[PDB]
Design a protein around this ligand. Structure first.
Ligand SMILES: [Zn+2]
Ligand SMILES: [Zn+2]
Lengths: 331, 331
């Protein structure tokens, strides 16, 4: 009965100088304070984001896992590490470097710390190669961003990558990143509060409404971060539009809501009513506990929202433990 | 009991020739085919969008309106006619006719057909005095968009505008418009399933997190179309961000969920669980029945969702009749 958190991030101890060998402007690296308790993710010379020790230090993280009653945590790249805009070969080198750093992180206690890998998604062949290599090396799966510029998950290159993983039994976490919105949502974390749930919804609907699930083998294990964004709540409007508009039916042979048996979501929706609706839509077998640790907006008491919810007790057990153990093949 | 429907749309019988007096190109007009049972919308030459002989030919509505237990139906501009892009005075000039053509469509039965006015929201005064003039002529309120044609949607410009309306007792229906993700969402009405609900959430949150409802008189009557988009589902995540991030609190002195008392939404969420969560969040006093009739994606059983739900009798009543009656002051 291990309590599993499957949505969490790490960032490796990369020096400015090493990041500079990749991109002096765009490669992230880590600056650590004096006391050693805090630091910032950097981009060239700019502060990109303040972080704390649990992000880069597995010893310290274990102690906090202990304090949260978290038995096993799955952790993956902070999305700033993706490098989807870089020249392909440099990005494939970078992913291999990041993925080895992840394995060194997990090696502190690989019974309790599991890792997912990143891939150079801008090149299908290198991405498939890196996925297979990383999983054979000990990663339990891959974390990708939800889009690659104007390419959403329905794009042939992304569908091909998903198919590869399906065929190789490689589970996928899809994480929103590089949020839409441009110039109008630049205050009060609006891109996190508005653009990010829209991104995740869009990625899910791109697979559904393009008929991608009719081409991708049922073996695909794929989870969408952050509760699937606004997907659960907006699904009625999607089923309605599908029934009453031809251009919505065009490539999708079944009502959209039926495809929920093809994917998973995490539980990070920050409200009992919201989580109940999510479980109602997805089914108790397809929601996994994830906290977004160790980021500020990560769940303060991991699993607390699930245990406070009105859900059945077996549904609670599945969300806290059972569903992830199965999804990521943890024993 | 009555059965009000505060969300429905119309488009007047403007000619190719007469519409060209504003803009033969960017200013829309109604092509009925020839006979009675069909017609299309032209921007001038091109076919903008097909449409339905019930959007106009009023009393036919009464058939539908009576065919579906409806009694009083508020109705307003199909968003094509906003012209927020344009030269101010000619859109000012343009809103006039549409608003005049509005009552002309309401003229048939000013008791069972109420209308709201469009304004040139791109110039305050023009929109102000037009909002003013239009109501005096019988309009029940004002429908605006969240955008301003191609805008970032916040300022004391519109703060002053909402204030203006709050003082002169002018209700507002906000309607999502000209959506956000541009080069993506090219298919399957993705802009309607994804961009528009995010847009409406963005409008609302922009008011809350700007600390606008603090300076706007509580007298403001404002309703958000389509259930407030994804607002209700995503609110927990918004409250969590406000509680744990300073920048989210910079201008909003209360948790955002505390501001639900300053606004209204319709019930058009096409799902019972979605509806139940909507009501749990906003309160029975602040959700109203609406349909987006006669549009294809409009509710097919006007009020049937609300009616076949398991909410309280007071709830069903305040939603189908009570709140519509008070918001728009209707007997
Ligand atoms: Zn995350
Ligand atoms: Zn509408």
């Amino acid at each position: 009965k291990p309590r599993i958190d499957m949505h969490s991030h790490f960032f490796p101890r990369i020096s400015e100088q090493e990041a500079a060998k990749f991109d002096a402007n765009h490669a992230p690296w880590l600056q650590v304070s004096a006391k050693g308790d805090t630091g910032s993710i950097m981009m060239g010379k700019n502060n990109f984001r303040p972080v704390y020790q649990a992000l880069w230090d597995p010893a310290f993280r274990i102690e906090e896992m202990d304090a949260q009653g978290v038995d096993v945590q799955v952790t993956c790249a902070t999305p700033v590490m993706f490098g989807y805009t870089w020249e392909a070969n440099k990005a494939a080198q970078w992913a291999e470097r990041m993925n080895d750093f992840a394995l060194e992180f997990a090696a502190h206690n690989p019974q309790r710390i599991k890792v997912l890998a990143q891939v150079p998604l801008q090149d299908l062949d290198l991405a498939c190669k890196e996925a297979s290599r990383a999983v054979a090396a000990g990663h339990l799966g891959i974390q990708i961003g939800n889009h690659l510029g104007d390419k959403d998950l329905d794009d042939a290159t992304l569908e091909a990558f998903l198919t590869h993983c399906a065929n190789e039994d490689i589970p996928i976490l899809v994480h929103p990143w590089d949020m839409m919105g441009g110039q109008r949502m630049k205050k009060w974390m609006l891109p996190w509060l508005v653009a990010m749930p829209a991104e995740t919804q869009l990625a899910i609907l791109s697979l559904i409404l393009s008929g991608a699930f009719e081409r991708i083998p049922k073996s695909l294990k794929i989870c969408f971060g952050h509760g699937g964004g606004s997907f659960a709540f907006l699904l009625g409007a999607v089923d309605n539009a599908w029934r009453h508009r031809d251009i919505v039916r065009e490539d999708c042979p079944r009502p959209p809501s039926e495809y929920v048996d093809r994917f998973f979501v995490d539980s990070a929706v920050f409200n009992p009513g919201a989580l109940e609706l999510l479980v109602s839509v997805m089914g108790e077998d397809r929601v996994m506990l994830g906290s977004d640790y160790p980021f500020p907006l990560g769940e303060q008491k991991i699993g607390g929202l699930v245990l406070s919810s009105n859900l059945g007790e077996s549904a609670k057990d599945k969300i806290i433990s059972g569903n992830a153990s199965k999804f990521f093949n943890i024993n």
